[PDB]
Design an enzyme around this catalytic site. Sequence first.
Site, PDB file in Angstrom:
ATOM      1  N   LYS A  50     -51.887  -1.363 -41.273  1.00  0.00           N
ATOM      2  CA  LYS A  50     -51.557  -2.679 -41.855  1.00  0.00           C
ATOM      3  C   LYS A  50     -52.247  -3.763 -41.049  1.00  0.00           C
ATOM      4  N   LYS A 101     -40.763  -6.247 -23.005  1.00  0.00           N
ATOM      5  CA  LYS A 101     -41.163  -7.386 -22.188  1.00  0.00           C
ATOM      6  C   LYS A 101     -40.697  -7.259 -20.745  1.00  0.00           C
ATOM      7  N   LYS A 112     -51.409  -9.691 -37.296  1.00  0.00           N
ATOM      8  CA  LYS A 112     -51.851 -10.968 -36.751  1.00  0.00           C
ATOM      9  C   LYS A 112     -52.063 -10.886 -35.246  1.00  0.00           C
ATOM     10  CE  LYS A 112     -48.691 -14.261 -37.074  1.00  0.00           C
ATOM     11  NZ  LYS A 112     -48.645 -14.828 -35.702  1.00  0.00           N
TER      12      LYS A 112
END
Lengths: 341, 341
Positions: free
Chosen positions: B201, B116, B204
């Site tokens: 996988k 970040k 989200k």
Amino acid sequence: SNAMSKPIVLSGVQPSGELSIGNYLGALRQWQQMQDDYDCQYCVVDLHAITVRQDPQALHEATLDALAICLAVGVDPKKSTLFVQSHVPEHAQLGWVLNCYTQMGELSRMTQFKDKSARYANDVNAGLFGYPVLMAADILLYGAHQVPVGSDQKQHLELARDIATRFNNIYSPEQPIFTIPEPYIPTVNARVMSLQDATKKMSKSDDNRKNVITLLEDPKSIIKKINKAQTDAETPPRIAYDVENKAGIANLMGLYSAATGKTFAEIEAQYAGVEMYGPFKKDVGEAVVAMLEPVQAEYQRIRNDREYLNSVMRDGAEKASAKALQTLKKVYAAVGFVARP
Amino acid sequence: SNAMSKPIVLSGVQPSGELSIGNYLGALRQWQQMQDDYDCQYCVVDLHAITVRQDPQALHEATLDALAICLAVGVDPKKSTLFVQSHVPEHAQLGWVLNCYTQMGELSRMTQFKDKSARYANDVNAGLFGYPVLMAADILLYGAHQVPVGSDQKQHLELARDIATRFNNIYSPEQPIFTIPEPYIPTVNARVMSLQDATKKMSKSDDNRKNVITLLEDPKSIIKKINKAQTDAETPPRIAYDVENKAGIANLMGLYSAATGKTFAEIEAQYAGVEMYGPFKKDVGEAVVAMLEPVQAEYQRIRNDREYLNSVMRDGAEKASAKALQTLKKVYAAVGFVARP
């Protein structure tokens, strides 16, 4: 109308170290008057104390010491808001939110952090780094207009201003949520100098204790320290006020003036023709003891009345939280949180 | 005897993004059972959401969405402790204290922060840097023995362990104050893969939404996405379970099995001799809709019953604070603070 017409002042009171006679004459002596002219909050900042490793029992007792010194100099729990920081849950809560509006770079460039980073190596903790954000929360919760800050706290106050401005610009550009604090200007510019180096301001954190008189210093120690104070090289000795050429005597004259109410013109006349500094230094020490003793006596009484101190803490925390929660609710609503029902 | 004999689990529920069918099958589907086998807390982590700039109204509504999804999958406010983080003041309070026992280096080396920092440049805020400390407080307040953590939260959980250990070693080496948390082990190892890349996988946060079915996804979108799912190159088509050679079909079989309760052996027999994947993909989509629809219906009802949601929030905050305050008081006493009277 009525408290709403005076500026709001928030003072931070450390529960560590020992306050000096300079802190007394420069600040605390005026607190009883300030309490009338301003809407004052006095916050004993125990959450900031633990940014350095504290002996628990020492911190506990130092907290009570700080509270009692406030009371001893005339802070009245009914006329001011006097409380212990950790007792008021809104402080840590607003602090977390404000972290999210503080840039890492703003904290990394703080001189106080850079010093401690250098001292503690890899041990440097995130509390020492982040305490300017918590200080900002401490101030902004009360909508303080003014905050007394020492030289070492000025950069921190500027960050509080920056954080408040940033938040207001995002959430409330027309009706600001936060008040932008300014420095408080003390009403007495006391000039209390180190006793054995009158060119240097008396510092409570001086490693050389010969330079320092503390507010709770034993009268016998005060007398000894003043009797060993710097005078000057004038021959024959002459008691006259002159900071550039007679710094040591000027410092002693400032102490004597504070302690007795005598002007420099009266002091000069009092010692006219006296060609020795010894009697004068004895007079100064006795005068300083007589000034501090009544404060010390009130302190020692108040300090060991735990039922009273508990009342003060309880009432202060309630009064402070009632104000702080109003600010916290507005901040929480603005950022988008669901209000606790 | 009785909750005292089950392990304490604390789960963090984000009020942002949209949960995937993988999150459902891997975790949330099992929450109703976990609530019986463990002493469960579910914390909607709104204080962590504001480490990135949120639209206020969106965050408000996302908080309610998260609460309602917990209720819809069977989290019971009487059997679990379900609450919004910002409603429980002890979280930010313990977070501040724990900052003082966290090394700057421990936070600077966090991979999530380093990412970040690189994205936001000088804007990177101190909340993003410090949120592992608040996460540690979130866990330790409840004495959680176990915490479910995703791959991206494992390092953060390790820091919580380190902070708890450090604090215990200083203040309570014989009778520890904090419980040292461990990862929770899910009871179903669901293998829900990206619909158009069955080797990856399902995520989200995937920018490619063709790969993802969300828990609150419109049934018509679910049907379309499953009808465009990856199958395999086998000719003639054969519905048989094989992750290495038939990954796409294996993923569809896993979804169909979850949705219907049919074993892979029953599914293989059901489609024995059927040399086409089209009807099977239609069956899978319909089965997945039928599995999710009842959850969606319960969600949509609960979500617009604000009186009920408010009851849930009020009762949960009270229940959580009652537990958290016990821990906070012990921490405050240990470090040396004067207790609020």
